[PDB]
Structure formats: C-alpha cells, structure tokens
Amino acid sequence: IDDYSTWDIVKATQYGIYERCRELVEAGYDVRQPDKENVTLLHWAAINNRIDLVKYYISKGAIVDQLGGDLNSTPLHWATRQGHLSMVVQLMKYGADPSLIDGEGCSCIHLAAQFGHTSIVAYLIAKGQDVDMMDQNGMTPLMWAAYRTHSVDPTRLLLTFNVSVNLGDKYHKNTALHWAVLAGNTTVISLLLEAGANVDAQNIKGESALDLAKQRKNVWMINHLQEAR
C-alpha cells in the first residue's frame, strides 16, 4: 500500500495529495522554488485542476502569474491549455491576467480557441476579453479555431459575437476562411461562408481562399466556395 509518504512535492501536487504537499511545505519547501524544468508548483496544481492546492500555495505566497516551462507561460496559461474552466475561474479571481502572452505569442483566449475549449472561450468573452483580440502572431480566436478545431465549436460560438469575419492575420493576411481551407477544415468552411466570409479576398501573396481551394484540387471545397458568390 503506497501511502504517498515517499512522494516528492511535484508528484504529490500533480495527484492532488493535499496533506503530503502541506507537510513538505511546512518542513521547508519554498512554494516559490521552481523545479529542474523551471516549473512552479502553482503550474502543476493549475494544470491538474487542484483547486484547494492552488488556494493553499497562493496563501503561502506563490506568484500567481509567474512564467515557467519551455513555453514560458503562467499557471493560468496551463489551466487554459488543459481546459479546466473552474481553474481558469479560480485563478482569475486571485488576479491572474488572461491577457498575458506565452512564449508562442498567445494569450488565454487564443489558447482556449486553438484547443477547442468552447466554454472557456465563452467565459473569457463574458469577462471582457475582446472576441477579435489579436495575439502576437496577429491571429484572432476565429483564425485559431479555423486552423486547429475541426469541429462546429468553438467556431459557431465565436460567430455569435460581432466578429470582423474578413480580418487577416498580421504576417500572412490569411482570413479565417483561408486558414480553414489551408487546414482542410470542412466543418468550419460552411460556418464561415454562412457568416459572410469573402471567398475572393486575397492574402499577402494575393491568393484568395478560392485560389487555395483550387490549389489543393479539393472538388468539394471549390464547389462550396464558388457557390457562395
């Protein structure tokens, strides 16, 4: 019978073994001290939805938005990637800043968009994040959805707000429709056309979304875009 009395504080945090973590802290483990991966205990707690451990570590003075890991992200970033709405809610209540950007240039709304976490996208919008917030790459949440979520949501949710459907990202000037064609995201293509996506608007290389469709020799895509003019 493993009783956790042998586990290190990182493994015990991951698994939410609350009393194990608390004994290691009072015995001298600094809640602010990172591990060999430059990850803090708050990060591990957040990405495993350990609500109570999060309260406890913060009460011991853990830094809420401390960057860590190879991707150089806050604990809130981690919870957002993983999809823990309750943890996103909890961390934002302690002052975590959802607009901070990680090492990939993304803030929280983009992380939630690109991993398909529809309820967190809704929540960030309900807390004041702009639906068309541009990340460091010039990507909107709708672009990230078109590119990465091959699914009705979160695209359908995003289109219920006053998005500027024909924006293009900063470096490629690809609209969300461009991204969906690029990615073969057939579910999203119909939603964007139905929401007014311009099939002729050209990116920075002067290719329209129809051009990209024709390029990929995808008969279904070419027909569907052509019939939306």
Partner: peptide, 10 residues
C-alpha cells in the same frame, strides 16, 4: 491520467 508533462510545441 493526471498531467505530469509540461505543455510543448506542436
């Protein structure tokens, strides 16, 4: 399972 690996590049 629990998450015991840090987020990585795609």
């Amino acid at each position: 399972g629990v998450v015991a690996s840090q987020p990585a590049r795609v």
